[PDB]
């Protein structure tokens with residue numbers, strides 16, 4: 113049933129700018145389900161576990177891929193958070209609660225829940241930082257999660273009980289997608305491999321050029337680098353598949369403002385349409401916006417700042433203004449040097 | 457109908473002065489919020505976006521005043537929370553969810569009426585890391601609460617105790633506004649590092665300070681999201697707040713206007729205090745400007761102005777009750793210096 | 803009727819000697835506190851201001867003595883807390899709310915009578931940042947403490963534990979702090 | 981309640 117060719121096209125409809133990452137997920141997703149079709153029946157013994165490790169910058173679409181995949185996929189999907197997770201459940205939460213929410217989506221169907229997908233956001237949150245210690249969000253969380261990720265049956269009261277019984281739902285079959293923004297990881301990889309600082313005439317020095325630090329550096333990531341970050345090596349050993357996402361290109365940004373149905377121009381113009389005046393954006397403004405956005409280095413999430421701040425003056429006085437049929441925005445408006453000219 | 461940006465700003469002008477740049481920002485959000493709440497999830501463009509404001513300004517610039525005045529004219533519910541007590545990872549003290557439970561007291565347990573509410577936070581700068589990207593000891597209000605808040609702004613549902621069965625309710629935050637703003641301390645040093653680019657020793661090294669450069673207002677205006685990363689904020693948290701408002705330091709003229717034009721101007725408050733005693737209080741124009749000059753030297757903002765007035769009239773306030781048959785009291789510019797005593801009218 | 807600065811100062815003179823300027827500040831604050839409370843709820847000048855006090859002086863000079871002597875003559879509730887035994891973000895030490903809890907013990911858990919009370923703090927310099935110019939980390943009882951007090955002096959109901967798991971809300975915008 | 985660790 114799974115198709116790697118079609119799934120890549122489907123993700124392209126909702127995600128843009130990450131072509132390599134789509135290929136990685138299609139292989140792991142196809143392999144994981146194929147394994148369950150014939151479980152441990154092949155001649156090959158000790159088959160490697162198929163897991164996913166999403167790693168990319170902010171606004172790269174980590175949370176977006178989990179949403180799009182859930183809609184396209186038939187099995188139930190869940191969206192949890194690592195910040196809420198706590199060890200030995202004092203007042204925050206428990207690891208077993210993740211399984212309870214999965215059944216609510218699957219309507220207490222063990223046969224249908226074991227084939228489900230799991231996605232945990234902000235994986236970096238559980239990084240073990242116990243230099244000055246007890247720790248409720250550090251080693252305790254990762255230790256409990258590793259036990260679950262290893263594959264074990266955990267007691268879960270079905271429906272809560274009206275019984276003193278619990279179901280032994282398997283865990284090795286269920287898939288897991290550990291993803292989150294890694295801050296400081298680039299420095300760790302750069303610290304290990306620099307291959308520079310040559311003072312000789314023959315030697316070369318690169319101060320601004322960083323050999324595509326946003327994308328190339330991620331491609332050369334190793335498990336040993338994450339160990340210094342704080343993660344446990346056994347946790348990384350269980351995830352042979354890692355996804356690397358490069359920084360969005362200026363071309364990709366333009367596509368994100370036009371092709372998607374959640375585009376800023378579409379919603380903002382729709383909002384202006386309610387007022388009664390149409391909104392027009394030229395192509396020259398779009399490429400200009402992309403350059404400013406990349407400078408901020410905030411991702412797509414910070415794109416809105418440039419568009420809104422530029423239109424702050426226009427929206428403030430637009431209701432008072434009358435007899436304006438359409439609004440025209442030029443490239444200079446993005447810079448802010450020239451005010452936009454209205455159409456009557 | 458809904459209020460217009462010009463109409464709401466005319467109301468804010470009575471309580472706020474010299475912050476034109478900030479009044480327009482709050483006006484568009486309120487206008488956008490009502491427009492978002494005007495249509496019943498029906499629009500030409502689906503998935504209407506949410507914009508979060510980040511108020512940044514000097515000390516005593518009027519940030520806390522705007523959130524208070526906004527709730528008076530705002531019809532929808534409003535809450536005034538604080539980031540001081542936020543406890544990430546469920547430690548002792550208040551939790552992020554509390555902000556939502558507090559929003560029901562003003563809304564009187566109305567979920568449909570609560571999702572259309574506005575939220576304001578203060579002292580958001582205080583929860584930033586100490587100019588270090590990696591946290592060594594898992595800061596509860598550093599690398600903690602900042603992350604915890606991400607889920608709420610992004611849009612999720614959190615269980616809240618209905619009363620003080622014991623079942624909980626779910627309320628989404630995807631269509632709830634949040635105004636997180638606080639006076640950042642030491643931000644000027646970071647901005648100077650990235651924009652002055654003239655440090656060093658030499659004939660051709662541009663080094664001119666304490667006279668022209670290092671202006672508080674100019675530095676804040678040139679702020680960018682990349683600058684906050686060196687300060688301690690996480691980029692994820694900054695991504696959820698695209699809008700940014702840069703307030704300025706109160707000018708000498710602004711102080712004079714704030715002394716008389718506001719409804720609750722300090723000059724009027726003291727007159728009310730003196731009015732009940734039975735003695736009128738008048739301030740001569742010349743005297744008012746002198747007080748403004750002293751306030752700027754203190755570098756404490758509008759709040760510091762009370763100190764100057766209190767000291768100037770400290771002696772008169774002590775002797776006014778024991779004195780009798782006094783109709784009017786006039787304060788002169790010399791009285792502010794303290795060399796002379798204000799005249800009295802019998 | 804109400805007292806006067808000359809009358810209240812004559813009382814403090816019995817317990818304090820050699821402090822002319824210090825007595826004037828406390829007299830005006832107390833004399834002004836009763837006016838703000840009475841001129842409540844449709845007083846021509848709306849939104850009446852507040853003016854706290856910051857006492858500074860050498861060791862053994864009589865700072866702590868003024869807070870004690872004031873409670874003898876002050877009819878409204880008064881307390882004497884300290885900032886040393888305080889920690890922010892709900893740490894092992896007492897939280898900022900504690901101060902308000904001590905006020906109700908003397909006020910008999912009267913919310914209406916607690917808002918019109920006076921508060922005093924001693925040894926405020928301890929929470930002062932100890933010249934922490936390098937941003938190595940965040941203090942537990944220093945800079946953080948001051949941050950939590952900001953919202954208190956302006957006024958914000960935070961919590962009251964009643965001697966029942968429902969807390970009480972107590973305004974602090976009109977409460978004075980010394 | 982909470983945890984304290986520094987030097």
Ligand SMILES: Nc1ncnc2c1ncn2[C@@H]1O[C@H](COP(=O)(O)OP(=O)(O)OP(O)(O)=S)[C@@H](O)[C@H]1O
Nearest residue numbers: 127128169170171172173174175176293368412413
């Ligand atoms: N790759 C992308 N392509 C197009 N739009 C994107 C992309 N990434 C983010 N966006 C836009 O940003 C919004 C939020 O994206 P998110 O996926 O939440 O960002 P995020 O950084 O992945 O979140 P985190 O870091 O995992 S909490 C989306 O609704 C889009 O409008």
Ligand SMILES: Nc1ncnc2c1ncn2[C@@H]1O[C@H](COP(=O)(O)OP(=O)(O)OP(O)(O)=S)[C@@H](O)[C@H]1O
Nearest residue numbers: 472473514515516517518519520521639714758759
């Ligand atoms: N623009 C202004 N116009 C008139 N009065 C002002 C203005 N800004 C500040 N004030 C006065 O200063 C008082 C406190 O203002 P705040 O809003 O607390 O300033 P602030 O910037 O919020 O200080 P922080 O952030 O709490 S340190 C107000 O009650 C006014 O009396």
Ligand SMILES: Nc1ncnc2c1ncn2[C@@H]1O[C@H](COP(=O)(O)OP(=O)(O)OP(O)(O)=S)[C@@H](O)[C@H]1O
Nearest residue numbers: 817818819820821860861862863864865866867868
């Ligand atoms: N003006 C004064 N007249 C008479 N006795 C005084 C005076 N000032 C201080 N004392 C004496 O000093 C004692 C302690 O006064 P304190 O108020 O503790 O001084 P202090 O400056 O507050 O010391 P601290 O605050 O603990 S460092 C009193 O009990 C008196 O015996």
